Amino acid sequence: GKGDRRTRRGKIWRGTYGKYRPR
Amino acid sequence: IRIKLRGFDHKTLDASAQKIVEAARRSGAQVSGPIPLPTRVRRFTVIRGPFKHKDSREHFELRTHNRLVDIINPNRKTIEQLMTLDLPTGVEIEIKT
Amino acid sequence: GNKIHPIGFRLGITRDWESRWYAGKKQYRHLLLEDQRIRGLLEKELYSAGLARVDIERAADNVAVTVHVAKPGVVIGRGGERIRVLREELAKLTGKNVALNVQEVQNPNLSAPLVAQRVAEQIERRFAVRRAIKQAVQRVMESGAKGAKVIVSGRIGGAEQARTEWAAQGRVPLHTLRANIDYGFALARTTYGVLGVKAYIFLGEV
Amino acid sequence: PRSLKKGVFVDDHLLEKVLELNAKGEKRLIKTWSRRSTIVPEMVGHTIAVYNGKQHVPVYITENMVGHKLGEFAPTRTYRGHG
Amino acid sequence: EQYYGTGRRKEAVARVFLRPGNGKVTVNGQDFNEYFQGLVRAVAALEPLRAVDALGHFDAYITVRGGGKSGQIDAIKLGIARALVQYNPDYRAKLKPLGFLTRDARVVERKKYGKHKARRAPQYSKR
Amino acid sequence: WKLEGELRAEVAANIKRLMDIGCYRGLRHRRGLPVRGQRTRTNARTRKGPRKTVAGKKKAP
Amino acid sequence: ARKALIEKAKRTPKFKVRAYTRCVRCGRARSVYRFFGLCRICLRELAHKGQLPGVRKASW
RNA sequence: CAGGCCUUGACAUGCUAGGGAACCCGGGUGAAAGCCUGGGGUGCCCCGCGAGGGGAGCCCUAGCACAGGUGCUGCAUGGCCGUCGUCAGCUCGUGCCGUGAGGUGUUGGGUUAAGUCCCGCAACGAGCGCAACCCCCGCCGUUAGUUGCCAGCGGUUCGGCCGGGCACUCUAACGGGACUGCCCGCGAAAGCGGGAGGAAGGAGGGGACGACGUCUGGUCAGCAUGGCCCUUACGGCCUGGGCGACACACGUGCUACAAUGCCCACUACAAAGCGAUGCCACCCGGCAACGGGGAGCUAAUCGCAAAAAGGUGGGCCCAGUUCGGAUUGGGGUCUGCAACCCGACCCCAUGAAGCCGGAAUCGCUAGUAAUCGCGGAUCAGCCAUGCCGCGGUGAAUACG
Ligand SMILES: [Mg+2]
Ligand SMILES: [Mg+2]
Ligand SMILES: [Mg+2]
Ligand SMILES: [Mg+2]
Ligand SMILES: [Mg+2]
Ligand SMILES: [Mg+2]
Ligand SMILES: [Mg+2]
Ligand SMILES: [Mg+2]
Ligand SMILES: [Mg+2]
Ligand SMILES: [Mg+2]
Ligand SMILES: [Mg+2]
Ligand SMILES: [Mg+2]
Ligand SMILES: [Mg+2]
Ligand SMILES: [Mg+2]
Ligand SMILES: [Mg+2]
Ligand SMILES: [Mg+2]
Ligand SMILES: [Mg+2]
Ligand SMILES: [Mg+2]
Ligand SMILES: [Mg+2]
Ligand SMILES: [Mg+2]
Ligand SMILES: [Mg+2]
Ligand SMILES: [Mg+2]
Ligand SMILES: [Mg+2]
Ligand SMILES: [Mg+2]
Ligand SMILES: [Mg+2]
Ligand SMILES: [Mg+2]
Ligand SMILES: [Mg+2]
Ligand SMILES: [Mg+2]
Ligand SMILES: [Mg+2]
Ligand SMILES: [Mg+2]
Ligand SMILES: [Mg+2]
Ligand SMILES: [Mg+2]
Ligand SMILES: [Mg+2]
Ligand SMILES: [Mg+2]
Ligand SMILES: [Mg+2]
Ligand SMILES: [Mg+2]
Ligand SMILES: [Mg+2]
Ligand SMILES: [Mg+2]
Ligand SMILES: [Mg+2]
Ligand SMILES: [Mg+2]
Ligand SMILES: [Mg+2]
Ligand SMILES: [Mg+2]
Ligand SMILES: [Mg+2]
Ligand SMILES: [Mg+2]
Ligand SMILES: [Mg+2]
Ligand SMILES: [Zn+2]
């Protein structure tokens, strides 16, 4: 879910990037 | 020979687009007529009252219109007669090669 | 309290700005603060001259303050000495080549900002507030205005229970955009508090 | 935490206070307001008075509390529960 | 050799070019069915030449930008409806009653202050 | 990596360490309140547990 | 505590992280816009007067 | 709030006296503020081969006049705002009625979103309102053609990239367009039902706009302002704390409880905005936050930028789970003088409640609700899941 930061969905929510949502 | 015109009022911005193009059309020849670029709107949204009445606002904006002007063949009979031009107060001219 | 400022409402349709110039984001505020510092000085000094509107134009390190006024001879003074007593004190806070101009107002009783200052001074001089309004609305109508409306809010006659009083003649369409309604507010300070004076002058539709 | 590209933070004025004591055969009671100054090995064995906003609480510093800040040991709010 | 129309709907503009052909349709370089793949509302974009049995009498070279996939579908549906009647005016009747030649102007009503959306209001609580 | 029991013992050892020295985090783990800056006036229920409803102040009739 | 806070705000601080905008007109600290030097209230008073170049009551 | 400090004071105009300075670089102590200090070197018009003596921006020490107060009173007030209510209303001038308050007009018949309009009438007009004039959206035209666009011939490293063109799309200014103007029907009329043309039809959709007044409504803490009040303190500077507390209770929201879902990979389609100790292409280091390089852009050109849901392919198989992401341990990153109280982000691990919610209760009538993401203001950073905007996909229902 959007609250799960360790996912490509939660990173979109916080507007941030990481291993779980790279660019 | 390129001129770009900025100004808050578009009526002064637009009137000064003919009063420039038609000058370089008096000292010919080739001119590229007044093209308008997209406007840049700076929006301000303010609580209407001085205190606590949060769900009532009033909108404001500052419109910075933009026009482009190109003179193809210089011919210094304008490089003198454009320096001798009478453009209104609220407008910025900026001239590029 | 609900009604919108008749000038801000008509800005672009019937009222031009009192300051006209362009300035990219990097120095709008600086020219704006300067604009305010000027108006502060002139509204103080040129109060007894009958100040009605300060126009401030600006282009390239120079500024053209244009003062519309009831008694221009007061502003200029002796042959242009009191005029230049300001033309330089202005430029002492302007730094720029601060050109000053003086304009004659065709009718003072047709200038809403002055009517309000007149009535505001009449209460400071303890005149009858009810009478002092009906008198002013009378002069504006005799001067050809298509309608006028004047309003006093506060401790009229020093009454503990503050109050609002007004009078209006002709017509004052505040909802019409093509109506030219001059508007002017003045503040009247007395010993028992402060009083608000609002003036609406319907000049005509265009 | 503080980016270790930068140093470990001690307000310097507090750090002088402790290195003089070591040199002169410590220890005096050290009263500081730098609740932020990181506990640093040159402090163990001393006792620092930490201002929690009202008082200077004594704090005896031991080896097992080094990576911490001084404010951690002078709490700022007194509680005691609700009636 | 060419009969064009302009089709507009919801922040989406569409240039459609009707030309003689077998039936092949293209939209921005890709094939029609490759650009609206699986978007089951695709077929509706070609209903104008189903109201006049030219369903294979043309090839359409179409350009779209702005809006979304569906906003570009009715953008087409109006444009090809326009390019068609621009190929012959008699097509107007039987195309006007199908609502084809008309641009529906349903746009996103703006957000308004004191609200969560255009009209969705903050939840009322009387205490 | 260290797992099941040892990981719990090393997690327990660090909480225990924070409680022993008396640092602010140590008082949080004692009284059972949150540790990472969260406010407690309202929720904190995961850390506080079921609500303990008390009586409140009264109005006037 | 107000006028001495109009003053302390103008001054250059001990650390650049200690600087805050104040309304140049009324001295208010909150809701001051960078573009104008004005708070959200003076922004509305000068706007309606027409003493704000090129700003116009928006509507769309 | 605590403690350490200042006393014509952080700030204003004025008067003196002593210095006689202006300003810039330090130093001792101290948490800092502060207190104590140390350097050099002021023109102004002057008498000048002299001592220089004066005077003057501005400085500084003592002395005053005075400053200062977010102290109190919104039940003394201006200004601004909320509200009833974008509800259809509130009144005036003359005449008429009534001893008078007051009535008439403004009521009545019909019609409208409307005191909108029509007919009637001891009334006849008028004003503030309603409408309209104004802004955005919807169709067409003119004018323009770069930084925007590429219809058709030429190239083309296959990028509108080059020639070239402005047709189109767009961009932005001025115009056209709809008025019950037309037909059928009703009606005394205003109007109402339907039709045709038409992008749009009955006020096209949305905005801005809020009558006389109400609520002794709200704000002396935005500002202004009367009065009352404090004056080595109710003023001022600092450092630290507090505004973030937590047996509890309520409001507004975010995230969910799963399969119309979740997950990974591949792949499409927006709009409005912002961007010179700014936005950052691309490059290497790093699992990542980021870091180092490093072009372009004073921006229809360069950048934020990936839009997301979606489309395709594959994995999970009904589990407190590959649902959910709280809580907690450890390790970092970054802004900042400084992240203990009290920042945001990233990575390993931890993986709570929650199985659709009692009594009760909210919003929405259409590109609306619902859902998806995107931007801006404030801003060093950020507790934004808030607000103001933006488009994407797109219903259900109204008997009454
Ligand atoms: Mg998951
Ligand atoms: Mg709200
Ligand atoms: Mg008195
Ligand atoms: Mg558009
Ligand atoms: Mg939407
Ligand atoms: Mg807390
Ligand atoms: Mg003040
Ligand atoms: Mg700050
Ligand atoms: Mg601020
Ligand atoms: Mg009280
Ligand atoms: Mg009041
Ligand atoms: Mg009031
Ligand atoms: Mg109160
Ligand atoms: Mg009524
Ligand atoms: Mg009468
Ligand atoms: Mg009777
Ligand atoms: Mg009578
Ligand atoms: Mg009467
Ligand atoms: Mg009435
Ligand atoms: Mg009546
Ligand atoms: Mg009535
Ligand atoms: Mg009656
Ligand atoms: Mg209405
Ligand atoms: Mg009548
Ligand atoms: Mg053209
Ligand atoms: Mg209106
Ligand atoms: Mg009250
Ligand atoms: Mg007061
Ligand atoms: Mg005040
Ligand atoms: Mg509850
Ligand atoms: Mg929330
Ligand atoms: Mg809730
Ligand atoms: Mg971004
Ligand atoms: Mg579980
Ligand atoms: Mg359970
Ligand atoms: Mg799980
Ligand atoms: Mg941790
Ligand atoms: Mg912190
Ligand atoms: Mg289940
Ligand atoms: Mg439910
Ligand atoms: Mg409705
Ligand atoms: Mg969802
Ligand atoms: Mg920010
Ligand atoms: Mg937090
Ligand atoms: Mg956001
Ligand atoms: Zn202000």
PDB file of all heavy atoms in Angstrom, chain H residues 254-262:
ATOM      1  P     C H 254      -8.396  11.963   3.313  1.00  0.00           P
ATOM      2  OP1   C H 254      -8.211  12.347   1.892  1.00  0.00           O
ATOM      3  OP2   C H 254      -9.526  11.086   3.713  1.00  0.00           O
ATOM      4  O5'   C H 254      -7.026  11.315   3.790  1.00  0.00           O
ATOM      5  C5'   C H 254      -5.800  11.919   3.420  1.00  0.00           C
ATOM      6  C4'   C H 254      -4.633  11.099   3.881  1.00  0.00           C
ATOM      7  O4'   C H 254      -4.616  11.066   5.328  1.00  0.00           O
ATOM      8  C3'   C H 254      -4.641   9.635   3.469  1.00  0.00           C
ATOM      9  O3'   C H 254      -4.129   9.450   2.159  1.00  0.00           O
ATOM     10  C2'   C H 254      -3.782   8.987   4.542  1.00  0.00           C
ATOM     11  O2'   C H 254      -2.413   9.202   4.256  1.00  0.00           O
ATOM     12  C1'   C H 254      -4.144   9.814   5.774  1.00  0.00           C
ATOM     13  N1    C H 254      -5.197   9.191   6.608  1.00  0.00           N
ATOM     14  C2    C H 254      -4.886   8.130   7.470  1.00  0.00           C
ATOM     15  O2    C H 254      -3.726   7.690   7.520  1.00  0.00           O
ATOM     16  N3    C H 254      -5.873   7.600   8.226  1.00  0.00           N
ATOM     17  C4    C H 254      -7.116   8.087   8.163  1.00  0.00           C
ATOM     18  N4    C H 254      -8.051   7.529   8.931  1.00  0.00           N
ATOM     19  C5    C H 254      -7.460   9.167   7.304  1.00  0.00           C
ATOM     20  C6    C H 254      -6.476   9.685   6.558  1.00  0.00           C
ATOM     21  P     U H 255      -4.496   8.155   1.271  1.00  0.00           P
ATOM     22  OP1   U H 255      -3.611   8.221   0.081  1.00  0.00           O
ATOM     23  OP2   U H 255      -5.965   8.072   1.063  1.00  0.00           O
ATOM     24  O5'   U H 255      -4.052   6.914   2.169  1.00  0.00           O
ATOM     25  C5'   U H 255      -2.680   6.597   2.357  1.00  0.00           C
ATOM     26  C4'   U H 255      -2.482   5.477   3.355  1.00  0.00           C
ATOM     27  O4'   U H 255      -2.977   5.854   4.670  1.00  0.00           O
ATOM     28  C3'   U H 255      -3.207   4.174   3.068  1.00  0.00           C
ATOM     29  O3'   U H 255      -2.614   3.402   2.039  1.00  0.00           O
ATOM     30  C2'   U H 255      -3.191   3.503   4.431  1.00  0.00           C
ATOM     31  O2'   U H 255      -1.886   3.019   4.720  1.00  0.00           O
ATOM     32  C1'   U H 255      -3.456   4.704   5.342  1.00  0.00           C
ATOM     33  N1    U H 255      -4.902   4.871   5.659  1.00  0.00           N
ATOM     34  C2    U H 255      -5.462   4.074   6.657  1.00  0.00           C
ATOM     35  O2    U H 255      -4.832   3.239   7.278  1.00  0.00           O
ATOM     36  N3    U H 255      -6.796   4.270   6.923  1.00  0.00           N
ATOM     37  C4    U H 255      -7.630   5.169   6.301  1.00  0.00           C
ATOM     38  O4    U H 255      -8.815   5.234   6.643  1.00  0.00           O
ATOM     39  C5    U H 255      -6.989   5.956   5.286  1.00  0.00           C
ATOM     40  C6    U H 255      -5.689   5.790   5.006  1.00  0.00           C
ATOM     41  P     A H 256      -3.547   2.761   0.895  1.00  0.00           P
ATOM     42  OP1   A H 256      -2.702   1.863   0.064  1.00  0.00           O
ATOM     43  OP2   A H 256      -4.294   3.850   0.222  1.00  0.00           O
ATOM     44  O5'   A H 256      -4.636   1.933   1.716  1.00  0.00           O
ATOM     45  C5'   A H 256      -4.755   0.520   1.615  1.00  0.00           C
ATOM     46  C4'   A H 256      -4.866  -0.122   2.981  1.00  0.00           C
ATOM     47  O4'   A H 256      -5.202   0.871   3.982  1.00  0.00           O
ATOM     48  C3'   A H 256      -5.938  -1.184   3.163  1.00  0.00           C
ATOM     49  O3'   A H 256      -5.586  -2.439   2.609  1.00  0.00           O
ATOM     50  C2'   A H 256      -6.114  -1.216   4.679  1.00  0.00           C
ATOM     51  O2'   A H 256      -5.085  -1.976   5.291  1.00  0.00           O
ATOM     52  C1'   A H 256      -5.893   0.253   5.049  1.00  0.00           C
ATOM     53  N9    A H 256      -7.154   0.974   5.314  1.00  0.00           N
ATOM     54  C8    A H 256      -7.745   1.962   4.564  1.00  0.00           C
ATOM     55  N7    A H 256      -8.867   2.411   5.084  1.00  0.00           N
ATOM     56  C5    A H 256      -9.027   1.673   6.252  1.00  0.00           C
ATOM     57  C6    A H 256     -10.021   1.679   7.252  1.00  0.00           C
ATOM     58  N6    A H 256     -11.089   2.482   7.235  1.00  0.00           N
ATOM     59  N1    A H 256      -9.872   0.819   8.286  1.00  0.00           N
ATOM     60  C2    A H 256      -8.800   0.011   8.307  1.00  0.00           C
ATOM     61  N3    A H 256      -7.802  -0.082   7.428  1.00  0.00           N
ATOM     62  C4    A H 256      -7.974   0.785   6.410  1.00  0.00           C
ATOM     63  P     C H 257      -6.646  -3.251   1.713  1.00  0.00           P
ATOM     64  OP1   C H 257      -5.889  -4.114   0.773  1.00  0.00           O
ATOM     65  OP2   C H 257      -7.658  -2.288   1.208  1.00  0.00           O
ATOM     66  O5'   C H 257      -7.370  -4.231   2.738  1.00  0.00           O
ATOM     67  C5'   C H 257      -6.660  -5.284   3.365  1.00  0.00           C
ATOM     68  C4'   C H 257      -7.218  -5.580   4.734  1.00  0.00           C
ATOM     69  O4'   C H 257      -7.377  -4.341   5.467  1.00  0.00           O
ATOM     70  C3'   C H 257      -8.593  -6.232   4.772  1.00  0.00           C
ATOM     71  O3'   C H 257      -8.495  -7.645   4.629  1.00  0.00           O
ATOM     72  C2'   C H 257      -9.145  -5.791   6.125  1.00  0.00           C
ATOM     73  O2'   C H 257      -8.661  -6.636   7.156  1.00  0.00           O
ATOM     74  C1'   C H 257      -8.509  -4.410   6.300  1.00  0.00           C
ATOM     75  N1    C H 257      -9.413  -3.293   5.945  1.00  0.00           N
ATOM     76  C2    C H 257     -10.297  -2.792   6.905  1.00  0.00           C
ATOM     77  O2    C H 257     -10.301  -3.322   8.024  1.00  0.00           O
ATOM     78  N3    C H 257     -11.118  -1.756   6.592  1.00  0.00           N
ATOM     79  C4    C H 257     -11.053  -1.224   5.362  1.00  0.00           C
ATOM     80  N4    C H 257     -11.862  -0.206   5.058  1.00  0.00           N
ATOM     81  C5    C H 257     -10.156  -1.712   4.364  1.00  0.00           C
ATOM     82  C6    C H 257      -9.360  -2.733   4.698  1.00  0.00           C
ATOM     83  P     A H 258      -9.792  -8.590   4.483  1.00  0.00           P
ATOM     84  OP1   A H 258     -10.722  -8.337   5.612  1.00  0.00           O
ATOM     85  OP2   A H 258      -9.311  -9.978   4.259  1.00  0.00           O
ATOM     86  O5'   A H 258     -10.490  -8.084   3.148  1.00  0.00           O
ATOM     87  C5'   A H 258     -10.210  -8.689   1.896  1.00  0.00           C
ATOM     88  C4'   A H 258      -9.672  -7.682   0.918  1.00  0.00           C
ATOM     89  O4'   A H 258      -8.329  -7.300   1.319  1.00  0.00           O
ATOM     90  C3'   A H 258      -9.516  -8.170  -0.513  1.00  0.00           C
ATOM     91  O3'   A H 258     -10.713  -8.058  -1.259  1.00  0.00           O
ATOM     92  C2'   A H 258      -8.395  -7.293  -1.044  1.00  0.00           C
ATOM     93  O2'   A H 258      -8.884  -5.996  -1.351  1.00  0.00           O
ATOM     94  C1'   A H 258      -7.499  -7.192   0.185  1.00  0.00           C
ATOM     95  N9    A H 258      -6.539  -8.308   0.239  1.00  0.00           N
ATOM     96  C8    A H 258      -6.543  -9.344   1.140  1.00  0.00           C
ATOM     97  N7    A H 258      -5.576 -10.209   0.958  1.00  0.00           N
ATOM     98  C5    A H 258      -4.893  -9.712  -0.141  1.00  0.00           C
ATOM     99  C6    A H 258      -3.767 -10.181  -0.831  1.00  0.00           C
ATOM    100  N6    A H 258      -3.104 -11.290  -0.496  1.00  0.00           N
ATOM    101  N1    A H 258      -3.337  -9.453  -1.880  1.00  0.00           N
ATOM    102  C2    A H 258      -4.002  -8.337  -2.202  1.00  0.00           C
ATOM    103  N3    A H 258      -5.076  -7.795  -1.637  1.00  0.00           N
ATOM    104  C4    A H 258      -5.474  -8.540  -0.596  1.00  0.00           C
ATOM    105  P     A H 259     -11.181  -9.244  -2.235  1.00  0.00           P
ATOM    106  OP1   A H 259     -12.326  -8.739  -3.025  1.00  0.00           O
ATOM    107  OP2   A H 259     -11.314 -10.497  -1.445  1.00  0.00           O
ATOM    108  O5'   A H 259      -9.966  -9.405  -3.248  1.00  0.00           O
ATOM    109  C5'   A H 259      -9.796  -8.496  -4.329  1.00  0.00           C
ATOM    110  C4'   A H 259      -9.367  -9.210  -5.585  1.00  0.00           C
ATOM    111  O4'   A H 259      -8.021  -9.731  -5.401  1.00  0.00           O
ATOM    112  C3'   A H 259     -10.239 -10.403  -5.988  1.00  0.00           C
ATOM    113  O3'   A H 259     -10.338 -10.468  -7.409  1.00  0.00           O
ATOM    114  C2'   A H 259      -9.438 -11.596  -5.477  1.00  0.00           C
ATOM    115  O2'   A H 259      -9.677 -12.811  -6.154  1.00  0.00           O
ATOM    116  C1'   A H 259      -8.007 -11.115  -5.685  1.00  0.00           C
ATOM    117  N9    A H 259      -7.039 -11.781  -4.811  1.00  0.00           N
ATOM    118  C8    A H 259      -6.897 -11.675  -3.451  1.00  0.00           C
ATOM    119  N7    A H 259      -5.936 -12.424  -2.961  1.00  0.00           N
ATOM    120  C5    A H 259      -5.419 -13.069  -4.078  1.00  0.00           C
ATOM    121  C6    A H 259      -4.381 -14.001  -4.243  1.00  0.00           C
ATOM    122  N6    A H 259      -3.644 -14.467  -3.233  1.00  0.00           N
ATOM    123  N1    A H 259      -4.121 -14.447  -5.497  1.00  0.00           N
ATOM    124  C2    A H 259      -4.858 -13.983  -6.514  1.00  0.00           C
ATOM    125  N3    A H 259      -5.859 -13.106  -6.482  1.00  0.00           N
ATOM    126  C4    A H 259      -6.088 -12.682  -5.223  1.00  0.00           C
ATOM    127  P     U H 260     -11.651  -9.928  -8.165  1.00  0.00           P
ATOM    128  OP1   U H 260     -12.841 -10.049  -7.285  1.00  0.00           O
ATOM    129  OP2   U H 260     -11.673 -10.572  -9.500  1.00  0.00           O
ATOM    130  O5'   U H 260     -11.344  -8.387  -8.392  1.00  0.00           O
ATOM    131  C5'   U H 260     -10.318  -7.978  -9.292  1.00  0.00           C
ATOM    132  C4'   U H 260     -10.516  -6.553  -9.745  1.00  0.00           C
ATOM    133  O4'   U H 260     -11.872  -6.393 -10.253  1.00  0.00           O
ATOM    134  C3'   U H 260     -10.348  -5.497  -8.657  1.00  0.00           C
ATOM    135  O3'   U H 260      -9.846  -4.300  -9.249  1.00  0.00           O
ATOM    136  C2'   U H 260     -11.784  -5.253  -8.213  1.00  0.00           C
ATOM    137  O2'   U H 260     -11.995  -4.007  -7.583  1.00  0.00           O
ATOM    138  C1'   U H 260     -12.517  -5.350  -9.546  1.00  0.00           C
ATOM    139  N1    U H 260     -13.954  -5.649  -9.453  1.00  0.00           N
ATOM    140  C2    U H 260     -14.811  -4.784 -10.116  1.00  0.00           C
ATOM    141  O2    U H 260     -14.420  -3.824 -10.751  1.00  0.00           O
ATOM    142  N3    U H 260     -16.147  -5.077 -10.018  1.00  0.00           N
ATOM    143  C4    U H 260     -16.702  -6.133  -9.332  1.00  0.00           C
ATOM    144  O4    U H 260     -17.926  -6.266  -9.332  1.00  0.00           O
ATOM    145  C5    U H 260     -15.757  -6.984  -8.669  1.00  0.00           C
ATOM    146  C6    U H 260     -14.444  -6.724  -8.749  1.00  0.00           C
ATOM    147  P     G H 261      -8.273  -3.971  -9.262  1.00  0.00           P
ATOM    148  OP1   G H 261      -8.142  -2.491  -9.272  1.00  0.00           O
ATOM    149  OP2   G H 261      -7.630  -4.789 -10.328  1.00  0.00           O
ATOM    150  O5'   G H 261      -7.739  -4.526  -7.870  1.00  0.00           O
ATOM    151  C5'   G H 261      -8.082  -3.909  -6.641  1.00  0.00           C
ATOM    152  C4'   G H 261      -7.363  -4.581  -5.505  1.00  0.00           C
ATOM    153  O4'   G H 261      -7.639  -6.005  -5.535  1.00  0.00           O
ATOM    154  C3'   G H 261      -5.849  -4.491  -5.568  1.00  0.00           C
ATOM    155  O3'   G H 261      -5.366  -3.265  -5.044  1.00  0.00           O
ATOM    156  C2'   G H 261      -5.396  -5.725  -4.794  1.00  0.00           C
ATOM    157  O2'   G H 261      -5.437  -5.483  -3.399  1.00  0.00           O
ATOM    158  C1'   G H 261      -6.500  -6.730  -5.134  1.00  0.00           C
ATOM    159  N9    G H 261      -6.135  -7.665  -6.215  1.00  0.00           N
ATOM    160  C8    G H 261      -6.728  -7.724  -7.448  1.00  0.00           C
ATOM    161  N7    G H 261      -6.234  -8.665  -8.205  1.00  0.00           N
ATOM    162  C5    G H 261      -5.261  -9.276  -7.428  1.00  0.00           C
ATOM    163  C6    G H 261      -4.392 -10.364  -7.726  1.00  0.00           C
ATOM    164  O6    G H 261      -4.320 -11.013  -8.778  1.00  0.00           O
ATOM    165  N1    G H 261      -3.550 -10.677  -6.657  1.00  0.00           N
ATOM    166  C2    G H 261      -3.567 -10.006  -5.453  1.00  0.00           C
ATOM    167  N2    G H 261      -2.697 -10.427  -4.522  1.00  0.00           N
ATOM    168  N3    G H 261      -4.374  -8.991  -5.173  1.00  0.00           N
ATOM    169  C4    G H 261      -5.192  -8.674  -6.192  1.00  0.00           C
ATOM    170  P     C H 262      -3.986  -2.643  -5.580  1.00  0.00           P
ATOM    171  OP1   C H 262      -3.749  -1.335  -4.913  1.00  0.00           O
ATOM    172  OP2   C H 262      -3.989  -2.712  -7.065  1.00  0.00           O
ATOM    173  O5'   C H 262      -2.898  -3.652  -5.014  1.00  0.00           O
ATOM    174  C5'   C H 262      -2.683  -3.757  -3.619  1.00  0.00           C
ATOM    175  C4'   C H 262      -1.599  -4.753  -3.317  1.00  0.00           C
ATOM    176  O4'   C H 262      -2.066  -6.096  -3.608  1.00  0.00           O
ATOM    177  C3'   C H 262      -0.335  -4.625  -4.148  1.00  0.00           C
ATOM    178  O3'   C H 262       0.520  -3.581  -3.705  1.00  0.00           O
ATOM    179  C2'   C H 262       0.265  -6.017  -4.028  1.00  0.00           C
ATOM    180  O2'   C H 262       0.873  -6.182  -2.755  1.00  0.00           O
ATOM    181  C1'   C H 262      -0.992  -6.884  -4.074  1.00  0.00           C
ATOM    182  N1    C H 262      -1.303  -7.344  -5.447  1.00  0.00           N
ATOM    183  C2    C H 262      -0.699  -8.514  -5.946  1.00  0.00           C
ATOM    184  O2    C H 262       0.092  -9.166  -5.234  1.00  0.00           O
ATOM    185  N3    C H 262      -1.003  -8.910  -7.204  1.00  0.00           N
ATOM    186  C4    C H 262      -1.856  -8.202  -7.950  1.00  0.00           C
ATOM    187  N4    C H 262      -2.121  -8.632  -9.186  1.00  0.00           N
ATOM    188  C5    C H 262      -2.474  -7.015  -7.469  1.00  0.00           C
ATOM    189  C6    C H 262      -2.172  -6.632  -6.227  1.00  0.00           C
TER     190        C H 262
END
